[PDB]
Amino acid sequence: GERVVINISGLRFETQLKTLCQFPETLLGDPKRRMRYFDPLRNEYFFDRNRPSFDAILYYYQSGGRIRRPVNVPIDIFSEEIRFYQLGEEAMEKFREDEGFLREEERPLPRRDFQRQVWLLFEYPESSGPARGIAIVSVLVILISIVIFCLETLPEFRDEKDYPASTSFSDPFFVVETLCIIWFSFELLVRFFACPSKATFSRNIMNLIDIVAIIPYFITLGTELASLAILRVIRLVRVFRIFKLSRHSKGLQILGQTLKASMRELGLLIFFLFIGVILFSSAVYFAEADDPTSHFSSIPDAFWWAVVTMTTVGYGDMHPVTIGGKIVGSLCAIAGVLTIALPVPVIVSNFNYFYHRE
Amino acid sequence: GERVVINISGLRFETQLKTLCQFPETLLGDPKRRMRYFDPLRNEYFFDRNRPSFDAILYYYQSGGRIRRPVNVPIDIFSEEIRFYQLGEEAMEKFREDEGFLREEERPLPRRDFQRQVWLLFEYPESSGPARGIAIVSVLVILISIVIFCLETLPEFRDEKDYPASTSFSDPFFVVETLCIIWFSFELLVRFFACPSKATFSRNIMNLIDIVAIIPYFITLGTELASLAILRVIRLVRVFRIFKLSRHSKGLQILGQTLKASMRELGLLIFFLFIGVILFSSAVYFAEADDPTSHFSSIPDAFWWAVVTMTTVGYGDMHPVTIGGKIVGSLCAIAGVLTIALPVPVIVSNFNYFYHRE
């Protein structure tokens, strides 16, 4: 019925008044707010803004609600156009969601005036100067703990113990290890007793890492204060102190997000390598088993060669000695480069997204 | 109030006169300059130019000042449109900055009529024919200096000196080295005494390189004209004569710019390699230490294998001998290809930018 002709700098937009008033909380949806720009001389709402953006601004009313930025309008110009037309904050949220920007505030800081002071001081390194100092202290303790874990294995440092087992505070490594574990437990208990909600603390992967980085020390201490397999499993598990370096590194966080996103592609990479390894190890075992000098004793033994030829490591311990085995080894290296080159670009695209999104 | 209707070949642009006269130094901002195209018969400024470009040209007035080239208009056409509408030279500078072109003239040539003649002759190889000759002479001296540095180490050339230390101008290598150092010092002192400002000379990396390429010779000469550690450090530092080849090579300059730009990505690459090396060396030490034939004596010793498996060099000196060690070595080569493949595309994008920008 009623026809409203908008004029965005000479460009007429004749639309039905019903669609214009579908959203009555905007600049055009309020008749007493859009009367400022109305021109009674020509019976049109003359604006003096960007011309291409108003097409999307009008499609917002003509589609109920939908904000799709035209590909020929820059982000800032379109955002300013949304702000001028006062489409709303839900409009801005939909626009940012469509573009790719993600809006997540959360961060429920405690309001007890002391359960938030220490929480800020520890969780947020940039909240203070002492907070940055605490972050630096944590990084230093993590690095020396890694150094201790690696140095404990050097044969030189184990001289009086380098005798057969059949013929703890004095050990210099145990002192540094227990200081590192004390600091880890301290920064864990402070964060747990200063977190807003215990549900989020027991769910964050960056806190499960800190738990796993403390568990082996206490298992070993309890066992000492009185099986072999669990002991070696635990001594290997102790390596997860390098992953609590990810709280202080935005590169490791991006890497973790990339690996979580590219789970299907990592699985495809492993599956393709498994298929190729079985195929080429069978081919090179049967192509080389009649030569009395071959060192493939079985298809399971030719898997190691096939993985080092497909990955193009090629150590050279296991190689073919026959013409047919060398033909097979020639296609393993080429078919390995393709198998690997296929999903890795998808993983790299995920990394670039999470990296430049930062 | 006053309404001006522009007509870019049938396409009306009705804008407020105030926005049109916001910039009074342009073709449309001068009423006595835009009267040429005015059409009193239809009360419109009829132009006969490209239609899509005038949208951006009018947004320049409607946004105070801003030049954003429409994505559907070519660079040359839009530049010609800016030139026709006489928006100004600051408008052209903003346009080039938005596109990506960088404007840097500088080059403060001396005006002493002789402190610039030699400066041109040396700094700019294309200013003359003798300048090109000087550039060629510099490249030749650099190449023979590199050749001398490499040849001095050959065991064959050291025959009468190949006796234990316990049982200088005669040496043929010292003569060529001192001639090269004389030319390096000459081309450095001429450039320093012919530069416009001494502040820029003592700040350019391409001059710090020339200083470092001369320092070891004079340190050695002073020490000879009378410690061991600094002597070997200096003998290694002498290798930085290859980097003064970067003045004469635009590929090395692009490489240096790429490496300065991709500093965070180089750091991430090193950090990811360090994380993976520690992880897989711990895994392969603990997965293989119970085999009496293993050659990983410690986690620090399995780092070398992990770096050569992750980088897929795979020399083959250190390899796994156990089933678990071979499973671990299989994931080191795959997780190394991902770790490396992640930031290298960012570095390559930087190189392509700095390379095609040339």
Partner: nanobody
């Protein structure tokens, strides 16, 4: 599995010389600590010598100077040159190769009876 066979018998009297040898199968001596242990009848194990991986040779407090220990790293054998033999050192000299915290391997033993 792994066996550290030894060949060090004989009945050399006081004085003279005798060289015991220890050979390994499935174990590389260049990659493990090695050391001879003795055990006289009616007594317990007595440390004699040890050559760590890296040649940190250290003998006991009694047989120093008069004994020496060596390794090949190519023939995969660990030796023991018994010089200045005395009737005091009559025992069944064993051979042991080990890795600290992972495994220890012994030999059935060889008999050196000094008259």
């Amino acid at each position: 599995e792994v066996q550290l066979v030894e060949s060090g018998g004989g009945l050399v009297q006081a004085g003279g010389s005798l060289g015991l040898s220890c050979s390994a199968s499935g174990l590389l001596f260049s990659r493990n600590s090695a050391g001879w242990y003795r055990q006289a009848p009616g007594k317990q194990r007595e440390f004699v010598a040890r050559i760590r991986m890296g040649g940190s040779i250290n003998y006991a407090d009694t047989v120093k100077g008069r004994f020496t220990i060596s390794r090949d790293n190519a023939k995969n054998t660990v030796y023991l040159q018994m010089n200045s033999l005395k009737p005091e050192d009559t025992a069944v000299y064993y051979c042991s190769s080990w890795r600290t915290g992972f495994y220890e391997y012994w030999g059935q033993g060889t008999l050196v009876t000094v008259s």
